[PDB]
Design a protein around this ligand. Structure first.
Ligand SMILES: CCCCOc1ccc(OCCCN2CCOCC2)cc1
Ligand SMILES: CCCCOc1ccc(OCCCN2CCOCC2)cc1
Lengths: 153, 153
């Protein structure tokens, strides 16, 4: 992935997000409710020291679990460590595009986050333009009804 | 779906095809190996009377089953009945885009078929342009290795 947000202000991504669309390099990363990168973002809580705490949902044992993780800051403002989290682009008000990647061929998953339970075509376009550069083999998108549901059921 | 192939010559789609990409209106139509519209085209055998016999693979009971169905012709050369099959576009030599649709909100699945076990970017573009008009919520694509495998494993 060689798109990062120039001049990311991590404090300003704080609060409510909706995982509107997801994509991944391998179908097995997103295909089942329990697929490893099938993670539904709920809220981003950046620390004063500039780390990013993430609240998300995960279908684990036939159940929508609430989960909590801290992404540790790096020397690059748009890159955090868990396995790396890269912030591609955000207007802070509406949408945020991010990817997660490991080290191996690498696993890669990217989401289009939006602030509201609405299909934002403009954001989905930017998400698709960003993905053109990337070797994705599965893409998912969610309707407004599903965005208001635990684990988007 | 309001894109059909003008002047389709069904005889000329005869032979070997590869399901390179699939998309559907609902994630549950494609998400699992056993999802109902997760069908891998192998060969099209059009009848003299102008019907279309389809050989495909389907993961059913933990197994890649070989399956056989006849799509019956209609008054529209680009539309067959099984549940309707619509042929969107084909250059006969390289690619064929088709959709399958039921009657209800309708289930809708579309594929980009190619003649060879190769990622055809030009065909994938035409597939994506055709899908822009359609309410798809899952997209899959397969690599050359998977195209040579039963049920694309
Ligand atoms: C600003 C970008 C937001 C990043 O959001 C996330 C980044 C990584 C995530 O990783 C989830 C970790 C995968 N496992 C899921 C099952 O529980 C253990 C962790 C989740 C959200
Ligand atoms: C030229 C267009 C090719 C159309 O190819 C197909 C059209 C419909 C298909 O329908 C599959 C029927 C769904 N079930 C799968 C499990 O066995 C029963 C049938 C398969 C290929």
């Amino acid at each position: 992935v060689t798109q990062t947000m120039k001049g990311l202000d991590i404090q300003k991504v704080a609060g409510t997000w909706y995982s509107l669309a997801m994509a991944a390099s391998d179908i097995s990363l997103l295909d089942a409710q329990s697929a490893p990168y099938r993670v539904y973002v709920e809220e981003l809580k950046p620390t004063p020291e500039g780390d990013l705490e993430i609240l998300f949902q995960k279908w684990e044992n036939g159940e929508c679990a609430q989960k909590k993780i801290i992404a540790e800051k790096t020397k690059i403002p748009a890159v955090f460590k868990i396995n790396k989290v890269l912030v591609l682009d955000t207007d802070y008000k509406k949408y945020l595009l991010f990817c997660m990647e490991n080290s191996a061929e690498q696993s890669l998953a990217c989401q289009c986050l939006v602030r509201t339970p609405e299909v934002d075509d403009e954001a989905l376009e930017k998400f698709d333009k960003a993905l053109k550069a990337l070797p994705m083999h599965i893409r998912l998108s969610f309707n407004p009804t599903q965005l208001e549901e635990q684990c988007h059921i």
